[PDB]
Amino acid sequence: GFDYDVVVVGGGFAGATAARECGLQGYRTLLLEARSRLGGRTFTSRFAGQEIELGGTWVHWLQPHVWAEMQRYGLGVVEDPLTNLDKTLIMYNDGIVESISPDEFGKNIRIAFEKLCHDAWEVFPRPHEPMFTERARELDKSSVLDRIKTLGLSRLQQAQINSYMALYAGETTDKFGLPGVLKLFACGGWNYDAFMDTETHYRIQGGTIGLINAMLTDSGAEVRMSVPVTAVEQVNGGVKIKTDDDEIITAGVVVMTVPLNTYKHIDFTPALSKGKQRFIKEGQLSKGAKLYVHVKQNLGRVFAFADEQQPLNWVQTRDYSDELGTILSITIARKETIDVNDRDAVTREVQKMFPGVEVLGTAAYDWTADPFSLGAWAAYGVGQLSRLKDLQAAEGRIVFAGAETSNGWHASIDGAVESGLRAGREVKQLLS
Amino acid sequence: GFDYDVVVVGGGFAGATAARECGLQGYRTLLLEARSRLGGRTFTSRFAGQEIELGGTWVHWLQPHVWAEMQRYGLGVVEDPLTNLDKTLIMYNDGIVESISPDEFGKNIRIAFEKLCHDAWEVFPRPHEPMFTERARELDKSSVLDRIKTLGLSRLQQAQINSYMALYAGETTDKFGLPGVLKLFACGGWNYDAFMDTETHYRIQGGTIGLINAMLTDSGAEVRMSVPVTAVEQVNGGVKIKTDDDEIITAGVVVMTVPLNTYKHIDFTPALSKGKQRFIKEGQLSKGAKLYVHVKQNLGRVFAFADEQQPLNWVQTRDYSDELGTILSITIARKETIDVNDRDAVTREVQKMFPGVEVLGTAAYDWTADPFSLGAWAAYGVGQLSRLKDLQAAEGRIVFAGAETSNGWHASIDGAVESGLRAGREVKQLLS
Ligand SMILES: Cc1cc2c(cc1C)N(C[C@H](O)[C@H](O)[C@H](O)COP(=O)(O)OP(=O)(O)OC[C@H]1O[C@@H](n3cnc4c(N)ncnc43)[C@H](O)[C@@H]1O)c1[nH]c(=O)[nH]c(=O)c1N2
Ligand SMILES: Cc1cc2c(cc1C)N(C[C@H](O)[C@H](O)[C@H](O)COP(=O)(O)OP(=O)(O)OC[C@H]1O[C@@H](n3cnc4c(N)ncnc43)[C@H](O)[C@@H]1O)c1[nH]c(=O)[nH]c(=O)c1N2
């Protein structure tokens, strides 16, 4: 006789999915969200007359869980201008910006990536079972930089792949675990063209917040915002959940979906397992941020890499026209390379990359400074993928989810949805 | 004031999915199935001590809808012996069986398939929108044989690819539409290795029937078997459904999921649209059947193609050992090349392919003669993909689903699930 059958902590995609699964079973469901908004590491907002995505943005039909949701709710794709590019730039660590023929640019990043992931088929024949092969466990002793060193890439190819990999690590690539990258490549059909198409080409029709809201409406769950959970205690055959103002909610089962790097806000009684405590002490790697920039000039359809010692590591066109000018979408690997909330620094760096432009405005999100993410997309350090099961394991009546805990597209919205479907299955098992 | 909110006609994957979607919304849901069993064009059975799948069998994590279901219900994959093959055979139209080095066999089918589908990226950048490009519509005037003629393949490669394509057509390849094949290739990550991995490598843990049952149990729907629908009439703002014994059930909405080739059993009032009537008169192409064969000898891990003038077009090992012998899984493109229910003919043909073996038993399913399939997997003839929307369109309070009506993996379980998710969404729209 608890207040609720299940309490879901966190209202990003993992928690919204889990609440939808539980609510459709008829369970009395409550979702507690710490921020005063839903979406978590996705955030739909508005800027220079456009809808923008300040966190997770792009999806793909090769991503099975989010795609099945878009099928269920009737959401199409919205194509960003990634094809027929006008300008493809590389900014080297030394600050030189070089314009490359788009054809040659794409050929060289494809060569670099296919070399980096040359053994993906043999190491990850089953990418949703990351430790299926012994070779995957053996490679979890290496970083991505360790492998890049052995490819003997050209200078352009080295700069491109190290930019790409620093972005995916949200860190320098000497800290970035290698098997996680090979696994993502395998999820994308074991080929560079398919994989790249999944990463920054198609957005969700109606936005990430539209899909979140659809699932939560569907769910019937009670949703409370601005309510951080600070303690969880297993007692009386269920759980007591304490919020920051010391109120207590009881439940038969709790689904945790908060980001790994935020677990320090929450006291567990009894303590979690040693393997989980080790993951919580380590956290996940990424220190990224995101920024949109409105410039007066029409730069057309552009793509730019910047290597890891520079701040504007992944640049794409979000919109362009003679009338509007250009909106640039810019993902920053390491918030320590640039204060995305310092407009003067941002204009300096944008002009470094595109000399001549005048900056009409910016919209930024510092995911690393936000207390309820404390980092960006999930990025595993060396040796962490090998221990993933420690983070996935249930502990009594507490179920764990979130993209960090997924097997497949762990750096994506899809991995969050996957973990939420798993969580709902586990709740059903616990309430049988 | 109808008997039910929605009646789902058909208990294969499309109907079970649609009923699950409707039941979880709380709609009063009934499913009518014509056979005395569920599963439709999947059928889990038993043979020589093993569980076998006499219809749809293999699935993949690149197939988004069925994979999301497996995630929801906790179903793993079961690997059949497709790697590290002992024997790879090609049987030519002239009846010669030739054993090919497995490495060479695989390289040659890969070359043939990558040439056949060379423009898949450009024609099907968005495989779930099959008519997105003008080139796709233009190509829908050509058959697969038209393209094979222009590739100038070697004799081995031509025989391999024509066997593969006759199987997918369930017909000779001069009748097989080309764009549907390019689209399937695109769904599979635009590359042969990924694509081939999706088609006959992994089975559903617990069987197709286990997933069907999980969805229907979840649904809460009322399920009736051995009850064929023979007429549907839209009247009084809903629908009157008549069964073969002239009983009448009323509903707000009906979801049709029966195979295209069986629509001749059902009278619609008012008549369906001309575009639908044209599809129903044409039907879909496939005339296939399936057979398992138990032989005394241990043949190990085998794969064989037979070209379209021969009957045992796709052969794989389902199980092998010295103790038990071998179980061969055999898919037949055209039931007119062999009477799979004629054990003597079956033994003759198996021995033609593997001379010397003793045939201990068989289990077969003639999908083409069965009145509630009248064919096997969905296979489009020339010009049909272009008109797919005619088949997909709702007609008043009648919703249409089934694998033939899906946009993506139309020849698969996945396409059926996809269409059932679409149907649930459309029912929700109609009942608002
Ligand atoms: C800048 C950037 C860019 C990208 C991406 C991320 C980011 C940050 N990703 C990844 C994607 O955004 C991410 O994997 C998912 O949104 C994670 O969803 P979860 O639900 O796991 O965590 P998420 O962090 O969304 O949800 C956790 C929730 O818990 C809440 N919370 C934390 N502590 C709490 C407490 N104590 N009590 C209560 N609530 C608490 C938080 O407020 C948050 O709402 C991405 N993906 C993709 O598919 N495509 C892309 O292009 C990108 N790009
Ligand atoms: C031999 C063989 C082999 C394969 C495959 C098929 C076959 C036949 N496929 C394809 C796959 O099996 C298929 O696409 C789906 O099962 C189709 O599901 P649907 O629900 O669309 O039709 P399905 O035909 O399953 O369901 C329709 C239902 O309607 C019923 N019905 C018909 N008329 C009726 C009436 N008047 N009233 C009531 N009910 C009526 C039928 O009895 C049937 O149950 C496959 N796929 C895959 O993913 N992997 C594979 O390996 C294969 N291989």
XYZ file of C-alpha atoms in Angstrom, chain A:
432
model
C 0.000 0.000 0.000
C 2.457 2.666 -1.159
C 1.615 6.109 -2.536
C 2.462 4.845 -6.051
C 3.294 1.578 -7.781
C 6.332 3.212 -9.426
C 8.174 6.521 -9.223
C 10.303 7.504 -12.220
C 13.101 9.942 -11.385
C 13.972 12.161 -14.342
C 11.938 13.505 -17.256
C 14.268 13.116 -20.225
C 13.702 10.492 -22.873
C 14.586 7.519 -20.665
C 12.178 8.548 -17.923
C 9.387 9.569 -20.311
C 9.643 6.209 -22.059
C 9.602 4.266 -18.768
C 6.609 6.274 -17.496
C 4.763 5.627 -20.759
C 5.444 1.863 -20.467
C 4.340 1.743 -16.819
C 1.274 3.941 -17.224
C -0.046 1.895 -20.140
C 0.064 -1.162 -17.857
C -2.230 0.613 -15.445
C 0.393 1.152 -12.756
C -0.143 4.211 -10.584
C 2.845 6.182 -11.876
C 4.578 9.377 -10.735
C 7.475 11.122 -12.509
C 9.679 13.533 -10.561
C 11.791 16.004 -12.580
C 14.428 18.248 -10.971
C 14.454 21.092 -13.553
C 11.428 23.317 -14.161
C 11.177 21.824 -17.695
C 11.020 18.393 -19.342
C 13.436 16.987 -21.944
C 16.610 16.551 -19.902
C 19.629 16.638 -22.237
C 17.248 17.645 -24.998
C 15.887 21.188 -24.943
C 13.680 22.646 -27.680
C 13.872 26.435 -27.723
C 13.606 29.393 -30.092
C 16.250 31.678 -31.611
C 16.345 34.199 -34.488
C 12.833 33.165 -35.531
C 13.613 29.418 -35.642
C 12.966 26.437 -33.432
C 16.336 25.110 -32.216
C 17.579 22.078 -30.294
C 20.130 23.056 -27.657
C 20.869 19.417 -26.730
C 20.159 16.154 -28.495
C 18.948 16.953 -31.996
C 19.385 14.393 -34.801
C 17.874 10.889 -35.184
C 17.689 8.151 -37.845
C 15.603 5.176 -38.940
C 18.570 2.879 -38.293
C 18.047 3.814 -34.629
C 15.347 1.274 -33.809
C 13.833 2.516 -30.534
C 13.365 6.212 -31.326
C 12.269 5.301 -34.859
C 9.580 2.940 -33.557
C 8.348 5.791 -31.332
C 8.193 8.170 -34.292
C 6.185 5.527 -36.151
C 3.819 5.128 -33.196
C 3.250 8.885 -32.841
C 3.329 9.842 -36.543
C 6.462 12.006 -36.457
C 8.320 12.535 -39.743
C 11.917 13.668 -40.235
C 13.047 17.220 -40.942
C 16.176 17.352 -43.093
C 19.033 19.737 -42.205
C 21.245 20.874 -45.135
C 24.040 18.259 -44.932
C 24.126 17.330 -48.652
C 25.418 19.366 -51.604
C 27.653 21.429 -49.310
C 29.027 24.840 -50.304
C 31.999 24.923 -47.863
C 33.781 22.231 -45.866
C 36.446 23.556 -43.490
C 39.037 22.007 -41.199
C 40.526 24.085 -38.391
C 43.760 22.516 -37.211
C 45.068 22.555 -33.650
C 47.470 25.341 -34.761
C 44.515 27.646 -35.599
C 44.772 27.466 -39.392
C 41.387 27.240 -41.124
C 41.576 25.479 -44.503
C 38.779 25.203 -47.046
C 38.697 21.733 -48.654
C 36.799 20.645 -51.742
C 33.661 19.009 -50.236
C 34.161 15.819 -52.266
C 37.758 15.439 -51.055
C 36.737 16.386 -47.503
C 34.134 13.590 -47.408
C 36.482 11.050 -49.022
C 39.175 11.750 -46.428
C 36.951 11.537 -43.375
C 35.468 8.321 -44.782
C 38.953 6.840 -45.239
C 39.962 7.865 -41.715
C 36.805 6.407 -40.160
C 36.881 3.136 -42.096
C 40.501 2.670 -41.018
C 39.692 3.549 -37.393
C 36.809 1.029 -37.384
C 38.351 -1.595 -39.667
C 37.651 -4.540 -37.319
C 34.105 -3.460 -36.284
C 32.532 -6.538 -37.935
C 34.758 -8.975 -36.071
C 34.753 -7.157 -32.743
C 31.057 -6.187 -32.691
C 29.061 -8.722 -34.686
C 26.277 -8.087 -32.125
C 26.550 -4.418 -31.105
C 23.614 -4.719 -28.678
C 25.750 -7.232 -26.733
C 28.856 -5.079 -26.351
C 30.992 -7.712 -24.569
C 29.920 -10.628 -26.812
C 33.495 -11.098 -28.113
C 36.716 -11.486 -26.191
C 38.331 -9.050 -28.629
C 35.992 -6.271 -27.422
C 37.100 -6.854 -23.829
C 40.753 -6.877 -24.902
C 40.330 -3.605 -26.797
C 38.757 -1.963 -23.750
C 42.362 -1.491 -22.534
C 42.985 0.988 -25.357
C 41.935 4.567 -26.025
C 40.878 5.926 -29.398
C 44.146 7.885 -29.606
C 46.085 4.622 -29.167
C 44.429 3.325 -32.314
C 44.714 6.612 -34.262
C 48.473 6.534 -33.696
C 48.752 3.246 -35.635
C 46.706 4.169 -38.739
C 49.322 6.456 -40.293
C 46.649 8.887 -41.554
C 47.420 11.962 -43.633
C 47.481 15.289 -41.776
C 44.009 16.224 -43.041
C 42.640 12.782 -42.114
C 44.246 12.848 -38.664
C 42.798 16.301 -37.978
C 39.331 15.282 -39.191
C 39.111 12.044 -37.238
C 40.583 13.532 -34.097
C 38.034 16.368 -34.242
C 35.202 13.870 -34.719
C 36.518 11.698 -31.864
C 37.105 14.631 -29.470
C 33.500 15.663 -30.093
C 32.235 12.170 -29.343
C 34.405 12.017 -26.208
C 33.644 15.567 -25.092
C 37.288 15.362 -24.037
C 40.720 14.857 -25.536
C 40.961 11.569 -27.397
C 43.703 10.097 -25.198
C 40.982 9.652 -22.552
C 38.329 8.251 -24.933
C 37.641 4.511 -24.795
C 37.955 2.754 -28.169
C 35.371 -0.096 -28.076
C 32.467 2.343 -27.491
C 33.273 4.017 -30.835
C 33.597 0.745 -32.708
C 30.282 -0.320 -31.233
C 28.490 2.830 -32.392
C 29.960 2.298 -35.891
C 28.568 -1.259 -35.870
C 25.123 0.017 -34.788
C 25.222 2.171 -37.941
C 25.368 -0.800 -40.286
C 29.160 -1.286 -40.070
C 29.841 1.364 -42.704
C 30.878 4.996 -42.615
C 28.230 6.379 -44.979
C 25.323 4.851 -43.031
C 26.832 5.752 -39.670
C 27.501 9.385 -40.582
C 23.963 9.700 -41.949
C 22.598 8.764 -38.495
C 24.452 11.522 -36.644
C 23.519 15.047 -37.819
C 21.168 14.814 -40.818
C 17.509 14.394 -39.700
C 15.583 16.079 -36.869
C 12.283 15.036 -35.281
C 9.215 16.641 -36.831
C 7.746 18.788 -34.057
C 10.927 18.600 -31.978
C 12.250 16.462 -29.153
C 9.834 18.145 -26.767
C 6.945 17.085 -28.995
C 7.941 13.439 -28.663
C 8.522 13.775 -24.876
C 5.070 15.352 -24.482
C 3.425 12.687 -26.649
C 4.832 9.858 -24.495
C 3.946 11.587 -21.231
C 0.411 12.440 -22.339
C -0.020 8.846 -23.481
C 1.324 7.661 -20.111
C -1.332 9.158 -17.860
C 1.396 9.560 -15.218
C 1.385 12.340 -12.659
C 4.282 14.703 -13.505
C 5.941 17.066 -11.007
C 8.646 19.523 -12.044
C 11.242 21.423 -9.969
C 11.331 18.482 -7.548
C 14.833 17.039 -7.104
C 15.177 13.663 -5.444
C 17.998 13.668 -2.872
C 17.619 10.306 -1.122
C 16.157 6.868 -1.767
C 15.691 4.213 0.910
C 14.524 0.611 0.434
C 12.322 -0.272 3.399
C 9.103 -2.185 4.064
C 9.406 -4.091 0.814
C 9.299 -0.931 -1.329
C 11.104 2.428 -1.400
C 10.939 5.789 0.348
C 11.907 8.703 -1.898
C 12.976 11.958 -0.251
C 13.049 15.302 -2.085
C 15.201 18.325 -1.292
C 12.537 19.816 0.974
C 12.367 16.517 2.948
C 8.941 15.369 1.690
C 8.623 11.583 1.416
C 6.878 9.613 -1.368
C 6.584 5.845 -1.086
C 6.480 3.392 -3.963
C 6.754 -0.281 -4.835
C 9.528 0.412 -7.375
C 11.712 3.344 -8.439
C 13.223 3.864 -11.886
C 16.348 6.061 -11.777
C 17.091 7.849 -15.066
C 19.247 10.789 -13.884
C 22.620 11.249 -15.642
C 25.467 9.235 -14.218
C 27.451 12.417 -13.468
C 24.636 13.711 -11.209
C 24.409 10.701 -8.855
C 26.414 12.591 -6.232
C 23.194 14.533 -5.395
C 21.402 11.343 -4.167
C 21.971 9.243 -1.017
C 21.025 5.563 -1.314
C 20.069 3.378 1.643
C 21.400 0.759 1.617
C 24.447 1.788 -0.362
C 24.554 0.742 -3.974
C 26.841 -2.069 -5.065
C 30.594 -1.518 -5.298
C 30.539 -1.729 -9.099
C 27.951 1.050 -9.277
C 29.808 3.202 -6.748
C 32.929 2.843 -8.906
C 30.994 4.031 -11.975
C 29.572 6.949 -9.969
C 33.011 7.995 -8.721
C 34.376 7.821 -12.285
C 31.404 9.329 -14.098
C 31.306 9.605 -17.862
C 33.755 11.687 -19.871
C 31.932 14.398 -21.823
C 32.347 18.092 -20.965
C 30.636 19.515 -24.037
C 28.329 22.460 -24.668
C 26.199 23.670 -27.571
C 25.750 27.042 -29.280
C 23.781 28.589 -32.133
C 25.107 31.725 -33.845
C 23.226 34.115 -36.109
C 25.477 35.912 -38.626
C 24.367 38.491 -41.194
C 26.057 36.915 -44.241
C 24.615 33.963 -46.193
C 27.321 31.322 -45.854
C 25.177 28.660 -47.484
C 25.491 24.999 -46.545
C 28.686 24.655 -44.489
C 30.331 21.965 -42.416
C 33.474 22.448 -40.329
C 35.615 20.332 -38.044
C 37.929 21.914 -35.493
C 40.538 19.742 -33.784
C 40.581 19.266 -30.016
C 42.773 22.218 -29.014
C 40.195 24.561 -30.616
C 36.645 25.314 -29.451
C 34.187 25.136 -32.399
C 34.664 21.475 -33.004
C 31.515 20.609 -35.003
C 29.834 23.308 -37.130
C 26.830 22.848 -39.453
C 24.296 25.081 -41.144
C 20.903 25.057 -39.393
C 19.356 27.682 -41.743
C 20.460 30.068 -44.505
C 19.060 32.657 -46.891
C 19.949 36.026 -48.363
C 17.229 37.629 -46.233
C 17.943 35.917 -42.888
C 21.703 35.451 -43.124
C 22.955 32.219 -41.522
C 22.259 30.278 -38.352
C 25.199 28.037 -37.391
C 24.771 25.051 -35.097
C 28.032 24.494 -33.166
C 28.847 21.650 -30.819
C 31.763 22.214 -28.434
C 33.691 19.195 -27.195
C 35.227 20.815 -24.047
C 33.604 23.707 -22.254
C 37.078 24.671 -20.954
C 38.040 25.779 -24.505
C 35.398 28.491 -24.668
C 32.844 30.119 -22.378
C 29.779 29.693 -24.570
C 27.968 32.258 -22.370
C 30.615 34.939 -23.065
C 29.422 36.626 -26.251
C 32.726 38.371 -26.969
C 34.764 35.154 -26.822
C 32.144 33.523 -29.048
C 32.330 36.254 -31.695
C 36.130 36.112 -31.651
C 36.124 32.354 -32.231
C 33.400 32.450 -34.900
C 35.367 35.057 -36.822
C 38.557 33.026 -36.402
C 36.699 30.291 -38.270
C 34.794 32.610 -40.682
C 36.775 35.878 -40.961
C 34.653 38.860 -42.028
C 31.291 37.814 -40.560
C 29.309 40.022 -38.171
C 27.573 38.243 -35.285
C 23.935 39.256 -34.856
C 23.242 36.957 -31.927
C 23.855 33.726 -29.995
C 21.987 31.131 -27.966
C 24.015 28.758 -25.846
C 23.609 25.942 -23.378
C 26.408 24.913 -21.026
C 25.463 21.299 -20.357
C 28.597 20.737 -18.276
C 27.802 23.531 -15.795
C 24.094 22.618 -15.420
C 23.688 20.757 -12.077
C 21.159 18.277 -13.546
C 23.441 17.066 -16.375
C 27.032 17.857 -15.247
C 28.241 16.827 -18.684
C 26.852 16.248 -22.157
C 26.215 12.978 -24.108
C 27.425 9.708 -22.627
C 31.114 9.078 -23.355
C 32.970 6.107 -21.869
C 36.567 6.342 -20.664
C 39.071 3.523 -20.989
C 37.915 0.266 -19.434
C 34.350 1.436 -18.684
C 32.350 -0.396 -21.394
C 33.678 -3.697 -19.974
C 31.876 -2.945 -16.730
C 28.601 -1.646 -18.216
C 26.568 -4.448 -16.607
C 27.445 -3.051 -13.153
C 25.588 0.142 -14.077
C 22.685 -1.691 -15.746
C 21.994 -4.083 -12.851
C 18.881 -3.549 -10.755
C 19.462 -3.219 -6.991
C 16.476 -4.615 -5.097
C 13.447 -2.511 -5.966
C 15.474 0.208 -7.755
C 15.671 0.013 -11.535
C 18.361 1.953 -13.413
C 18.076 3.500 -16.861
C 19.348 6.429 -18.902
C 21.383 6.499 -22.097
C 24.653 5.721 -20.262
C 23.055 2.353 -19.301
C 21.889 1.358 -22.779
C 23.593 -1.308 -24.898
C 23.220 0.222 -28.355
C 23.192 3.969 -29.271
C 24.448 5.061 -25.850
C 25.430 8.573 -27.001
C 21.942 9.239 -28.412
C 18.273 9.779 -27.758
C 17.800 6.233 -29.005
C 19.843 4.729 -26.164
C 17.742 6.654 -23.648
C 14.506 5.277 -25.179
C 16.037 1.774 -25.229
C 16.854 2.012 -21.520
C 13.323 3.233 -20.810
C 11.784 0.221 -22.578
C 14.079 -2.053 -20.593
C 13.067 -0.221 -17.418
C 9.375 -0.745 -18.062
C 9.923 -4.459 -18.655
C 11.858 -4.671 -15.370
C 9.120 -2.816 -13.433
C 6.577 -5.299 -14.792
C 8.827 -8.119 -13.605
C 9.180 -6.582 -10.138
C 5.426 -5.960 -9.736
C 4.401 -9.538 -10.763
